[PDB]
Design a protein around this ligand. Structure first.
Ligand code: 8WP
Length: 227
């Protein structure tokens, strides 16, 4: 066998690859590996950990990623769809990925990606004001975000309070240099974990992303709002 399933469901390994929901198409120039044995054919896409914090996290040995076939996902800061494309591969045609991006430039890449992928919903909106787009968002199982400013963990939490089910999960990368360049990476990470806790987003694991990123963490946890 030439592509083995990874511990994480929907993730495969040769290095890290996902099953291409759109056979024949690359999203960001990634290699595509197709394996045929008779009439059976399956195409995978290379998942670059120097571009995608999530792939770096999986390679780094993260225990859970909480996306699987059928999962409903809210991705804040979807940019041009790099990481979202692979989340879309994993959740498959019965899952759903809401891809929120403020940038209109990035948004056009996202809409283009979503033309081919029925499970992506581009939402070209400011995640600071979820009320503007709340009527489009069915309640999700998992939220993803890259936090790069000192206000963004709260912005993620306001979206969790609006859209994330009780007992759903979050996967949040943290770019310490962008949050506070005058603080140590460790102090930024502790401060962001504390901001999470104060919003009932309870971390369950965390890791840094060396060698792919410097002073970049990924935190995985569970949302436990009060009644
Ligand atoms: N040009 C930009 O504004 C990039 C960007 C950052 N960004 N951060 C979040 C947050 F993490 F807060 F959820 C959501 C977004 C997003 O839509 N776009």
């Amino acid at each position: 066998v030439m592509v083995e399933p990874h511990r994480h469901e929907g993730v495969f390994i040769c290095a890290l690859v996902t099953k291409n929901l759109v056979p024949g198409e690359s999203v960001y120039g990634e290699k595509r590996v197709s394996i045929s044995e008779g009439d059976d054919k399956i195409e995978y896409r290379a998942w670059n950990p120097f571009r995608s914090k999530l792939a770096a996290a999986i390679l780094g040995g993260v225990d859970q990623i909480h996306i699987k076939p059928g999962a409903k996902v809210l991705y804040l800061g979807a940019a041009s769809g790099t990481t979202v494309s692979h989340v879309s591969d994993i959740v498959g045609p019965d899952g759903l990925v809401y891809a929120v991006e403020f940038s209109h430039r990035s948004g056009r890449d996202l809409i283009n990606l979503a033309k081919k992928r029925t499970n992506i919903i581009p939402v070209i909106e400011d995640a600071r004001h979820p009320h503007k787009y709340r009527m489009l968002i069915a309640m999700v199982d998992v939220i993803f975000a890259d936090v790069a400013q000192p206000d963004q963990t709260r912005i993620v939490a306001l979206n969790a309070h609006t859209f994330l089910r009780n007992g759903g999960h979050f996967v949040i990368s943290i770019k310490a240099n962008c949050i506070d360049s005058t603080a140590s990476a460790e102090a930024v990470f502790a401060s962001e974990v504390k901001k999470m806790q104060q919003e009932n987003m309870k971390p369950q694991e965390q890791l840094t992303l060396e060698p792919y990123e410097r002073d970049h963490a990924v935190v995985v946890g569970v949302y436990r709002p009060p009644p």
